[PDB]
């Protein structure tokens with residue numbers, strides 16, 4: 001199928017202000033989106049806020065404001081944050097939106113008509129902070145915000161409470177075999193692989209039915225009513241997960257306001273998601289519940305769920321103002337793969353800013369554009385190639401395919417490492433050929449050295465443009481790369497910018513080192 005590449009972040013609870021967690025998740029969503037745009041594909045990237053439920057209403061009660069005022073305010077803080085971080089998200093969704101609620105009711109009704117929702121009881125533990133049902137084996141002893149003796153979640157260490165309610169139940173138990181078929185048939189559907197193994201183990205152990213409504217009193221009436229039963233409200237997670245479906249059905253104008261909700265998801269060619277970006281703490285909701293609902297409704301399943309090492313639930317805008325926006329994005333994407341084992345100190349931030357961005361990339365951009373070395377201020381025409389020239393060229397030609405596979409996994413840290421390996425190689429080659437000497441001794445040779453250098457800088461910069469969107473534009477301007485050559489798989493190929501291309505005007509640092 002030729003469809004719109006549909007990439008999502010989770011929608012974030014509005015009990016608290018935006019923070020690094022949310023910023024991180026949306027950054028990954030943004031980068032994936034950007035990579036596919038650079039590739040030349042149609043892209044719809046989605047982010048947003050999760051505004052209903054017990055947790056949000058209780059956060060609004062603490063602040064002595066109405067849930068409507070509170071959620072609207074906090075949503076605005078998330079919107080301002082994501083504008084400031086310089087993302088390129090196509091739409092920001094809110095679960096308070098009327099069109100979203102329509103879709104929730106449609107979906108609810110569909111599940112009901114298939115006999116997959118019945119009236120039942122849930123008697124068990126529940127974390128209000130995670131909005132998660134827990135069995136007794138996922139709880140242990142602990143303390144609260146004061147220090148009294150209570151029970152807590154093994155998942156998250158938040159306080160749990162016993163709940164005994166008549167609830168609408170979804171027949172999740174009936175989807176165990178079909179979920180297991182899905183996991184085995186599509187062995188890259190959950191990334192990384194060890195989290196895929198976690199999910200499969202859990203589903204193999206057995207699946208209880210899932211409570212999908214709560215009594216309206218318990219939610220402080222801050223929730224979507226169940227169709228044809230106003231004493232019950234729809235479970236915040238069914239309401240939340242459905243944002244992806246809603247998003248896939250909203251037509252959106254040139255300034256990002258929703259204007260129309262289509263009946264059939266196929267009209268916009270977005271659903272199902274190609275990638276759901278999530279934190280590790282919401283894996284079960286996305287890999288177990290969400291597909292079970294979709295199977296029940298006869299809707300298509302997402303292709304990939306990528307679960308990163310961070311939790312979903314250190315001020316980024318402050319650090320971006322201190323070290324640069326692109327540099328901060330580079331650091332977060334480079335420093336952490338799929339575990340929490342990463343060093344986010346100012347020491348390490350500066351180490352990578354100076355080491356990799358300034359000395360490796362920045363230096364190299366200045367070398368191939370400086371008037372000392374590139375005297376004609378143009379892309380020269382190469383002479384014949386030595387075997388050492390060819391070895392570097394081979395690396396540059398192989399890089400797009402290698403990075404493409406990493407971005408598609410998706411493993412953004414590995415994509416960056418691949419590019420920088422080539423950058424290190426190019427630097428080694430330059431040091432070796434010493435082109436500063438060649439301006440005097442051997443002009444014919446310098447043409448070849450300089451051309452290869454420029455073209456390596458271009459190709460690496462193209463593949464880095466989803467990570468450093470602003471700086472990539474600065475680099476391409478210095479190199480004098482025409483706009484048409486700054487995207488499209490065509491321009492991943494070696495030799496795309498012809499010799500004779502004039503460099504851009506000089507002024508002037510790309511990344512400046514710090515103490």
Ligand code: MET
Nearest residue numbers: 010011012013050240241
């Ligand atoms: C369907 S994604 C919902 C994520 C949840 N609101 C959270 O903050 O973790």
